[PDB]
């Protein structure tokens with residue numbers, strides 16, 4: 001089997017991407033944030049505290065003839081931005097772009113934090129990291145991909161995120177028309193449950209390539225590119241007037257600036273992030289100070305190849321017995 005679904009930026013800055021997902025019988029279509037950095041599938045629901053729902057589409061398990069309450073199961077997730085969600089669990093039929101899984105754990109939210117409430121465009125998350133990170137208790141549950149894996153033509157999915165444009169998630173096949181040149185594959189460690197790999201280095205603009213190992217995760221659920229302080233300093237040094245601001249919470253730069261590209265290494269291959277991918281616009285409405293899309297990972301503990309990096313590539317999440325990651329230019 002295979003599946004193919006279009007993924008769309010939620011706003012003009014590509015702050016996140018949503019992908020339509022069919023849940024239940026008859027189908028209830030929710031727009032979910034496909035997140036290769038986590039392993040829960042959770043949704044806004046009929047059970048979510050009413051004051052915490054503001055515009056989102058909800059899953060109503062009582063209206064699904066295939067929904068079954070998973071007895072005694074609960075879930076709770078905290079995210080690094082201080083946001084959070086929690087609730088109970090159903091199993092139900094879930095389909096993505098024509099690919100169907102029966103008995104998928106669908107984690108129904110009873111509570112969500114204010115950041116989720118304030119964002120009407122995201123109806124929940126679909127995790128695509130390794131199932132060891134799933135938060136369901138007392139019995140951990142499997143990801144959509146893990147459930148679909150055996151049935152797929154090939155045990156893979158690909159992420160093809162657009163810059164200010166739609167893109168695609170494919171399951172079970174590699175679309176060889178979606179990239180240029182070759183796909184370079186690189187080793188993955190699953191020891192922390194992530195798609196964790198090691199970049200071979202970086203360049204800033206037309207600068208010299210720096211060979212240096214950068215261990216990080218391929219994370220579609222993170223907006224920006226988070227890299228070591230040394231690297232990030234080297235990047236913003238090439239932007240006149242750029243400064244790290246404590247009050248704003250990272251590097252900002254004059255909106256009139258022309259941003260240099262950023263290149264990262266995948267083995268001997270090179271992925272080039274165009275400079276305008278690194279512009280996330282005025283820090284507040286009407287400001288001439290803009291927020292940078294490359295930020296320091298120092299306060300995180302791990303480097304994160306978020307959408308800013310991934311959208312510059314065609315990315316293969318290879319879930320073979322020994323998983324690997326593939327990157328191609330496009």
Ligand SMILES: OCc1ccc(CN[C@H]2[C@H](O)[C@@H](N3CCOCC3)[C@@H]3OC[C@H]2O3)o1
Pocket residue numbers: 015016033035037038079080081082083122221222223226300304
């Ligand atoms: O956009 C919608 C949304 C909500 C939750 C997630 C999934 N990724 C999250 C990521 O894990 C968190 N990291 C990012 C890097 O700095 C440390 C904290 C951060 O906090 C929420 C979001 O970014 O996406």
